[PDB]
Write a structure and sequence with these properties.
heterotrimer; A: alpha/beta; about 40% helix; C: about 140 residues; Nucleotidyltransferase, domain 5; five-stranded mixed sheet; 5 helices; Integrase (chain C); dna integration; aids; polyprotein
Chain lengths: ~160, ~140, ~140
């Protein structure tokens, strides 16, 4: 939720969850807890490559971890990663508590989407609503910092 | 590498068999599992880790292998998982059929077959059975 | 002798644990079985005899060790049946308590404890582990 204190700023995890028969691709900045998410037409490697190219043109993505789905091991993905300078790593690191960072995120996210699902006509709107909420949520974790503020801050310090 | 192993699942008689092979010696361990689930595999690989020095394990993207139960056991045991023996599933099924008639149940025949494959004299001279080979490679490593 | 083994059944949480100890090294193999019968002892024996060169197996007169199902298994496997493990059992149960909470079923708790005993380096001026000694002895015997 608020990130892992011993993680580097370049690590990201990526997974696909499912809601109402739809495909939701998620990406989490392990160190802050910040996430990006989106509904996709199909669970293809072509769809996973677009998303990763969007994510690299904005954040300094060094390494991404994913499971071994056909969509994640495809050559379009692989090629995409090579182009972007991303080091791919198959297998989402295990954690005895959360099972997986990007795993507890897909859960928190379906939790939120569940609370605000009334205030939306399309799942696409709600997905984006949940992410906004997750990202602007502050907590004692650090002087009232949110996930969205932690990453720009972590990436700023790095650049500086 | 002595710590490298390959795991895979095969089918026979409307059943499922979990097969583990030591790539350096060709040594095998196998067992007929009630279902191709990640929990039956985790238990299996856990038995195999407190026995042999398992560092790395290679498998396909099969559900039971990309399961979290298996992921958790590998983390607890200190095993690095890789994805990406096929002959080993072939010889094993060959020997299973040579001793299948000596048993009613497949679970028993499979173990008779692993015993056979691991102890069968090779080269026309002792000391070279898959089972003899693994014990040497590990000791020469320790 | 590197081919001698001691087998015995111990109980925990109303379940049956079938323990096997390589007398020379101290290395063990444990397993919770459905029932304390010959069919289960046999099956277990054939897996152990398939990975390690077993010759003799020391058990008591338990109804499961003296069954013909177990006898025909030894015959097949070329194992002599003779009618340390006792202590081993006590050792094994001690570790099982240390990691018991780390597992849902006693099953894997038993396997976790076997992993811990075999990989633990201790005894004899502290150097090797029961798991490295067994491979060293059998390989020394083959060489």
């Amino acid at each position: 939720m608020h990130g892992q204190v011993d993680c580097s700023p370049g690590i990201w995890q990526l997974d696909c969850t499912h809601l109402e028969g739809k495909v939701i691709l998620v990406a989490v900045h392990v160190a802050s807890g910040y996430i990006e998410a989106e509904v996709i037409p199909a669970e293809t490697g072509q769809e996973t490559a677009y998303f990763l190219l969007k994510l690299a043109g904005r954040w300094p993505v060094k390494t991404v971890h994913t499971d071994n789905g056909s969509n994640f091991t495809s050559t379009t993905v692989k090629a995409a990663c090579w182009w972007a300078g991303i080091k791919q790593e198959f297998g989402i690191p295990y954690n005895p508590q959360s099972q997986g960072v990007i795993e507890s995120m897909n859960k928190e996210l379906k939790k939120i989407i569940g609370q605000v699902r009334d205030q939306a006509e399309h799942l696409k709107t709600a997905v984006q609503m949940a992410v906004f909420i997750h990202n602007h949520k502050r907590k004692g974790g650090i002087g009232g910092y949110s996930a969205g503020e932690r990453i720009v801050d972590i990436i700023a310090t790095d650049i500086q």
